[PDB]
Swiss-Prot record:
Disorder noted: Chromosomal aberrations involving CREBBP may be a cause of acute myeloid leukemias. Translocation t(8;16)(p11;p13) with KAT6A; translocation t(11;16)(q23;p13.3) with KMT2A/MLL1; translocation t(10;16)(q22;p13) with KAT6B. KAT6A-CREBBP may induce leukemia by inhibiting RUNX1-mediated transcription. Rubinstein-Taybi syndrome 1: A disorder characterized by craniofacial abnormalities, postnatal growth deficiency, broad thumbs, broad big toes, intellectual disability and a propensity for development of malignancies.
Stated name of the protein: CREB-binding protein
Described function: Acetylates histones, giving a specific tag for transcriptional activation. Mediates acetylation of histone H3 at 'Lys-18' and 'Lys-27' (H3K18ac and H3K27ac, respectively). Also acetylates non-histone proteins, like DDX21, FBL, IRF2, MAFG, NCOA3, POLR1E/PAF53 and FOXO1. Binds specifically to phosphorylated CREB and enhances its transcriptional activity toward cAMP-responsive genes. Acts as a coactivator of ALX1. Acts as a circadian transcriptional coactivator which enhances the activity of the circadian transcriptional activators: NPAS2-BMAL1 and CLOCK-BMAL1 heterodimers.
Impact reported for residue 102 to E: Abolishes interaction with ASF1A
Entry's free-text remark on domains: The KIX domain mediates binding to HIV-1 Tat.
The gene coding this protein: CREBBP
Residue segments, region Interaction with ASF1A: 84-102
Amino acid sequence: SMRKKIFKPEELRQALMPTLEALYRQDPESLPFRQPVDPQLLGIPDYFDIVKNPMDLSTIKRKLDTGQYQEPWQYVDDVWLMFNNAWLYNRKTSRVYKFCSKLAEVFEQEIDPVMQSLG
Ligand SMILES: COc1cc(-c2ccc3c(c2)nc(CCc2ccccc2)n3CCN2CCOCC2)cccc1=O
C-alpha cells in the first residue's frame, strides 16, 4: 500500500511550536529575526535586491498559529529560508551572520527529535 501522511492544523502547531519557541528564547541572537527586515529602518537600501524571498520569526509564528501550513517540511523550508537570507545578505564577520549560525545550531538540535516523531 502507498499513501501520503495527513496533518491537522492544531497537530502541526503543538509539535512544531517548541522548536520555534527555542529560536525566540535566544537573546540577543533572535532579536534581528523576530520581525520582518525593514530596510528603511535598518539603513540597508539594497536588501530587497539581494533577498528575493524575505522570511522572519513573526511570519513563521503567524502562519503556524493561523494554520497556513499543510506539511511539517513547509515549516522547515520557511525557517531555513530565513537563515539562508541572513547568511546571503550579511558579511561572515557580522553580528547578524553569527547570530544566524547560532539559531541554525539550536534549530537543528530541536527539529531532529521532532521530525523523527512526526514521520
Ligand atoms: C535578519 O537579517 C537582518 C537583520 C537586521 C536587523 C533587524 C532587526 C533589528 C536589528 C538588525 N537590530 C535590531 C535592534 C535590536 C537588537 C539589539 C541587540 C542585538 C540584536 C538586535 N533590530 C530590532 C529593532 N529594529 C529597529 C529598526 O526597525 C526594525 C526593528 C539587520 C541587517 C541585516 C539582516 O538581513
